[PDB]
Amino acid sequence: GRKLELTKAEKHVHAFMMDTQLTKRVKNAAANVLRETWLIYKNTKLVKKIDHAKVRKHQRKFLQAIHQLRSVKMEQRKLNDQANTLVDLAKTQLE
Amino acid sequence: AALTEEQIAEFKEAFSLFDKDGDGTITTKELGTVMRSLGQNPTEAELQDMINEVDADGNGTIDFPEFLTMMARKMKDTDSEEEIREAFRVFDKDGNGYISAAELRHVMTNLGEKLTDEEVDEMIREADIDGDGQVNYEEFVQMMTA
Ligand SMILES: Cc1cc2c(cc1Br)NC(=O)/C2=N\O
Ligand SMILES: [Ca+2]
Ligand SMILES: [Ca+2]
């Protein structure tokens, strides 16, 4: 039988965006990554003189959006392994 | 995604592991009970997500049809050799790839659900391949997963 094998995880995060809360979180945080990447780039590369207070503000908003996206991705991995737990339990009846 | 007729009947028994009251449907409350009996701690939102990902008709629970249809997409398995080797590594105090027979007996008779001293005797007999009182757990795991 299956012996020590377990359900193969999907190689890439791709699930549970039906959650709506996760989907809203990704949309807003990703848009903010785009916003703050642009505003940091503009304020460090497209200005005559760098306004460091402005750069600090957008670096703060940049890191919060990046880490928000990390948090969603880790929650997707958690959900995916919870679901694989249930699949593995059901598959014990194939023995 | 194809299930044999034999797999369909076996997954009917599987559905009963989840459908705890037997009323034909899996609720969030039942999945919480099942998940905690497996030593996990899903939040309410995580349980609702598990239901909602499989609930095709949106009535809030999972019926055997929805249960079976999603098992069909999840039949692929993969070997566990590396994860098992990593569980052994927890007890490799010096990170040298070895665990003594004495330390393995101590672990197995004190941690987890435990084994009897007789059961540990049988395990060490297989695990100590070279007879040197030391378990090369990579090689032991490779033997058991061969
Ligand atoms: C056995 C079982 C499997 C799954 C689930 C609920 C049950 Br029960 N919800 C899921 O997303 C899933 N697999 O991906
Ligand atoms: Ca039920
Ligand atoms: Ca349903």
Numbering used by the authors:
A (entry chain B): 395 to 489
B (entry chain R): 2 to 147
What's the paper's own text on this?
In the proximal carboxyl-terminus of the channels, there is a region called calmodulin binding domain (CaMBD). The Ca2+ binding protein calmodulin (CaM) that is constitutively associated at the CaMBD serves as the Ca2+ sensor of SK channels. In response to physiological signals, elevated intracellular Ca2+ levels enable Ca2+ binding to CaM, inducing conformational changes in the channel carboxyl- terminus and subsequently opening the channel pore. SK channels play essential roles in the regulation of membrane excitability by Ca2+ in both the central nervous and cardiovascular systems.
This was done utilizing four compounds,1-EBIO, NS309, SKS-11 (6-bromo-5-methyl-1H-indole-2,3-dione-3-oxime) and SKS-14 (7-fluoro-3-(hydroxyimino)indolin-2-one), varying up to 1000-fold in potency. Reminiscent of the binding pockets of 1-EBIO and NS30948,49, the binding site for SKS-11 and SKS-14 is also located at the interface of CaMBD and the CaM N-lobe. At the CaM-channel interface, between M51, M71, K75 of CaM and L480 of CaMBD, there is extra electron density apparently coming from SKS-11 and SKS-14, respectively. NS309, SKS-11, SKS-14 and 1-EBIO all primarily form contacts with L480 of the CaMBD and with M51, M71 and K75 of CaM. Similar to 1-EBIO and NS309, both SKS-11 and SKS-14 dose-dependently potentiated SK2 channel activity at 0.1 μM Ca2+. The EC50 values of NS309, SKS-11, SKS-14 and 1-EBIO for potentiating SK2 current are 0.552 ± 0.083 μM (n = 8), 3.87 ± 0.88 μM (n = 8), 33.2 ± 4.8 μM (n = 9) and 286 ± 31 μM (n = 6) respectively. The total Eint is −43.5 kcal/mol for NS309, −38.8 kcal/mol for SKS-11, −32.6 kcal/mol for SKS-14 and −29.5 kcal/mol for 1-EBIO. On the other hand, the electrostatic Eint is −12.3 kcal/mol for NS309, −7.9 kcal/mol for SKS-11, −7.5 kcal/mol for SKS-14 and −1.8 kcal/mol for 1-EBIO. For instance, the distance and angles (θ) from the main chain oxygen of M51 to the nitrogen in the five-member heterocyclic ring is 2.8 angstrom (θ = 134.7°) for NS309, 2.9 angstrom (θ = 164.2°) for SKS-11, 3.1 angstrom (θ = 129.7°) for SKS-14 and 4.1 angstrom (θ = 120.6°) for 1-EBIO. The distance from the main chain oxygen of A477 to the nitrogen in the “ = N-OH” group is 3.6 angstrom (θ = 129.9°) for NS309, 4.0 angstrom (θ = 105.2°) for SKS-11 and 4.9 angstrom (θ = 92.8°) for SKS-14.
